[PDB]
Amino acid sequence: KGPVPFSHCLPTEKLQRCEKIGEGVFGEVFQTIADHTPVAIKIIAIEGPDLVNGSHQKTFEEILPEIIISKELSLLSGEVCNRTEGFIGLNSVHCVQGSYPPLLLKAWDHYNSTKGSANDRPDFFKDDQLFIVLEFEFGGIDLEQMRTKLSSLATAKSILHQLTASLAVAEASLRFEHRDLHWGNVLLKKTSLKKLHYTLNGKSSTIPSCGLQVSIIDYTLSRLERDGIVVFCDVSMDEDLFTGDGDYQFDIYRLMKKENNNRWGEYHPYSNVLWLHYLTDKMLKQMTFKTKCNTPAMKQIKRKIQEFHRTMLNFSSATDLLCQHSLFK
């Protein structure tokens, strides 16, 4: 077949509505709308010689694991025995060719002026440059940007409960590890559902939403298996992944390496526990709740979450936490 122009993924009206909503070393994420429905578009340069955001571009083979894992996780919303909507929907993947669309560069510029960017302005790509364009369901706003917007300690418990269940279901279905579940990768969207449903090994349960649906995104470093074929990112030789400081996030990579003996092909669901611990730590230390923590009931929820924080590292997986931890009774 071969690639398609950016205009294929982003016809005039869709392109005009693109706004930048995030970034990483991988490239750029734009929100737009199609058939009256918001979507997020992740654009990753591939196969070219230019350094991008400090790193070499991936080949098509190197980007396949992300695509495969994005598809498997998206599929869980539709399964029976192990079902959850707690990841993100994947709509489509395309291989696109061109220089960066001028309208996306303007959107890039607007973000850089308001939020600041840690990326290079993507204005040096030639007309034959390839990209992978992944279109996802819009999952709302990341937990870091929502750190002053959560209502109450009940909201915090619901988010942790949703995260834990989603991970457990992915563990059970796919021997999944996220491996990079920093707070940019947890999305919150308003829902009018009072409770959310999941199914773990044929058993269905619900979790009070407190008005929010959580989505886990970005499977760049993730791992799973299907048909006893493991799909993963081998970061054994990536030293700078392990040398960060100034946030507990950067200890999580070191602690994962310790757990797995630097062997990233193996299944170690304890990594999901480590990420949950980091998120629980964020809930306790970096959130300013709109209703603060002002009643005996809210204080009690805070105490239960601190207890979770002090105990949860003695569990072996998200599935073990969900099924056995007192917080979820």
Binding site: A118, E144, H182, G184, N185, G244, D247, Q249
Partner: peptide, 7 residues
């Protein structure tokens, strides 16, 4: 937020 630290 980002996987590796970077201003």
């Amino acid at each position: 937020a980002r996987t590796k630290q970077t201003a």
